[PDB]
Amino acid sequence: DQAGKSPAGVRYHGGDEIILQGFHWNVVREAPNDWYNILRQQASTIAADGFSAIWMPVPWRDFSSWTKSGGGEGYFWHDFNKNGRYGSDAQLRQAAGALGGAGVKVLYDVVPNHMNRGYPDKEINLPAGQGFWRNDCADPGNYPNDCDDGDRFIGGESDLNTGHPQIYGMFRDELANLRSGYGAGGFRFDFVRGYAPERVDSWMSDSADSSFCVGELWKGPSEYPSWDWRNTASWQQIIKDWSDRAKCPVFDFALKERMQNGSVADWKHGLNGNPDPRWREVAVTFVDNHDTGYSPGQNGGQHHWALQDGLIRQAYAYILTSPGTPVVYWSHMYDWGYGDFIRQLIQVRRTAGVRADSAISFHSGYSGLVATVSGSQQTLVVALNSDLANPGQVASGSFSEAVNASNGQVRVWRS
């Protein structure tokens, strides 16, 4: 694995990451107090499957509960104590050690925007009236106020003033803690619409400057005020701007929006397809996550924006053969039987030398999506839901078949 920032200083850790999302939404219910144990036991398999990194659940304990029903998953944590619903502090250290020992960098989900302010038994107790909270200031709506330079979570009563020096420092120090005893190789920042992107740059500079990061900005143009340039911008432009200011890769919700609403041909309009390498190399691509996708267990998980099963193989073939940095969802890989297919695609990606900045060209004249990808070692031809007959119709050189699945709806050839 190679380290390094992008030419623009963006923390894509060499551009060669292949990431596993290491949980689904219902883990705390399906494997009570046992997930870190499971990850420890699976560390060698995860490495053998070809992942360079794993996105871990939020490590800060969360004993919240609401009624659909949920709670405890990490996104309404009450303090930084690691003895939460995924396992104990000791078990987390064992899992992170096993994953790192196997060559899988450990990326923690971190949630700076808010905390479970009302939880009665916690280590972090911030009073009102000192500027620590969004609602220490007038709060007329879901947009920045004088105590919170980003959006708010629901009603905002639990949003922290992350720009207050004490609160900034609290998170800075906890990121350093995670990088030390918990072996962090980077971070996934939750709800990045909730606080300034420049604060993510600062936190990473202070506590993990050479690590990998990714921000979750899931916010469409119509969610911005009519006078904001983003209101008339593309999904790509919105997430790219965040990445520029955080100096962090960003989840490719532009690609996800095309996968949900467009045709397969239109998947070329994700951030990861952009002809400018400074744009596509900051995209972190995915098929589904714990919010968008199903999960095993109660209510099928959240399934806010799930990709239908007739496109899952196509979507994994696209993200695993293309630029940007791909993320594989736990349940596709290890619950629902796509593992062998995904393993094969990961090997294709590695053997071809595809990285986040590899060139990708899209070809006209066929149905579906037809792309040529320039890896450092091989050129790939990728044909998804297409009437393309063979790679010589669209590329020079000698090719052999690498993938042929779903009655030819997924085909990949390599030079």
Ligand X SMILES: C[C@H]1O[C@H](O[C@H]2[C@H](O)[C@@H](O)[C@@H](O[C@H]3[C@H](O)[C@@H](O)[C@H](O)O[C@@H]3CO)O[C@@H]2CO)[C@H](O)[C@@H](O)[C@@H]1N[C@H]1C=C(CO)[C@@H](O[C@H]2O[C@H](CO)[C@@H](O[C@H]3O[C@H](C)[C@@H](N[C@H]4C=C(CO)[C@@H](O)[C@H](O)[C@H]4O)[C@H](O)[C@H]3O)[C@H](O)[C@H]2O)[C@H](O)[C@H]1O
114 labeled part of a ligand binding site: yes
Order of strands, sheet of 359-362, starting from the edge strand that comes earlier in the sequence: 359-362, 369-374, 379-384, 410-414, 400-405
Q: Quote the least distance from Cβ 382 to ligand X, whole Å.
A: 27
> Cβ(373)–Cβ(380) under 8 Å?
yes
From the list 303, 313, 201, the residue with the least C-alpha distance to 250 is 201
* H/E segment holding residue 105: strand 105-110
One residue of 6, 11, 13, 183 binding Ca ion per CB under 5 A: 13
* 159 annotated to a ligand binding site: yes
Q: Rounded to the nearest whole angstrom, what is the least distance from the CB of residue 158 to ligand X in the complex?
A: 4
Residue of 412, 283, 290 whose CA lies nearest to 28: 290
Query: Could you tell me the smallest distance in angstroms from the CB atom of residue 263 to ligand X?
Result: 16
Q: Which of 62, 73, 136, 190 is catalytic?
A: 190
Q: Is 241 annotated as a binding residue?
A: no
Residue 220, binding choice from Ca ion, ligand X, none, Cβ under 5 to 8 Å by partner class: ligand X
Q: Which residues bind ligand X (CB under 6 A)?
A: 64, 66, 75-76, 111, 153-155, 157-158, 190-191, 193, 216, 218-220, 290-291, 302, 304-305
Any idea what DSSP says for residue 58?
P
CA distance 222 to 308: 25
249 binds Ca ion (CB under 5 A): no
* Residue 1 within binding range of Ca ion, rule CB under 5 A: yes
**CA angle, 281 then 380 then 343, to 5°:** 80
Examine residue 150 and tell whether it contacts Ca ion (CB under 5 A): yes
Cβ closer to ligand X: 164 or 188?
188
Angle at 190 between CA 87 and CA 227, to 5 degrees: 165
Query: Given 201, 216, 257, 288, which residue is catalytic?
Result: 216
238 or 315: whose CB is closer to Ca ion? 238
Cross-strand bridge partners of residue 186: 107, 212
User: What minimum distance in Å lies between the beta carbon of 318 and ligand X?
Assistant: 20
Alpha-carbon torsion 357, 361, 366, 370, what sign?
negative
Q: Is 148 annotated as a binding residue?
A: yes
Distance CA 32, CA 139 (A): 38
Q: Which stretch binds Ca ion (CB under 5 A): 21-29, 35-43, 146-154, 226-234?
A: 146-154
Q: How far apart are CA 157 and CA 159, in angstroms?
A: 6
Binding status of residue 159 toward Ca ion by CB under 5 A: yes
Q: Does 14 bind Ca ion (CB under 5 A)?
A: yes
The gap between the terminal CA atoms of the chain, to the nearest Å, is 23
Q: Is 194 in the site for Ca ion (CB under 5 A)?
A: yes
Asked if 216 is an active-site residue, the reply is yes
What Rg, from alpha-carbon coordinates, does the chain have? 21
Q: Which is nearer to ligand X, 141 or 304 (CB)?
A: 304
Say whether 76 counts as a known binding-site residue.
yes
From residue 111 to residue 130, what is the string marking binding to Ca ion with x (rule CB under 5 A)? --x-----------------
CB atoms within 10 A of CB 335: 15
Distinct helix (H) and strand (E) counts, the chain: 11, 13
CB burial of residue 148 (10 Å; 0-12, 13-18, 19+): buried
Any known ligand binding at 224? Answer: no
- Contact status, residue 183 vs residue 96, Cβ threshold 8 Å: yes
Length in residues, the chain: 415
| Minimum CB distance to ligand X smaller for 99 or for 110 | 110
- Answer yes or no: are the C-beta atoms of 117 and 124 closer than 8 Å: no
Cβ proximity to ligand X, 305 vs 366, nearer residue: 305
Please report how close the Cβ of residue 324 comes to ligand X at its closest, in angstroms.
19
Instruction: Output the smallest distance, CB 131 to ligand X, in A.
Output: 17
Residue 212, token pair as written in the block? 């990998």
**Minimum distance from residue 14 beta carbon to Ca ion (Å):** 3
Annotated binding site: 1-2, 13, 16-17, 75-76, 113-114, 148, 151, 153-157, 159, 188, 194, 290, 302
Question: Can you say which residues are annotated as belonging to the binding site for substrate?
Answer: 75-76, 114, 153-157, 188, 290, 302
Residues serving a catalytic function are: 190, 216
Known binding-site residue numbers for Ca(2+): 1-2, 13, 16-17, 113, 148, 151, 159, 194
Residues near Ca ion (CB under 5 A): 1, 13-14, 16, 113, 148, 150, 159, 194
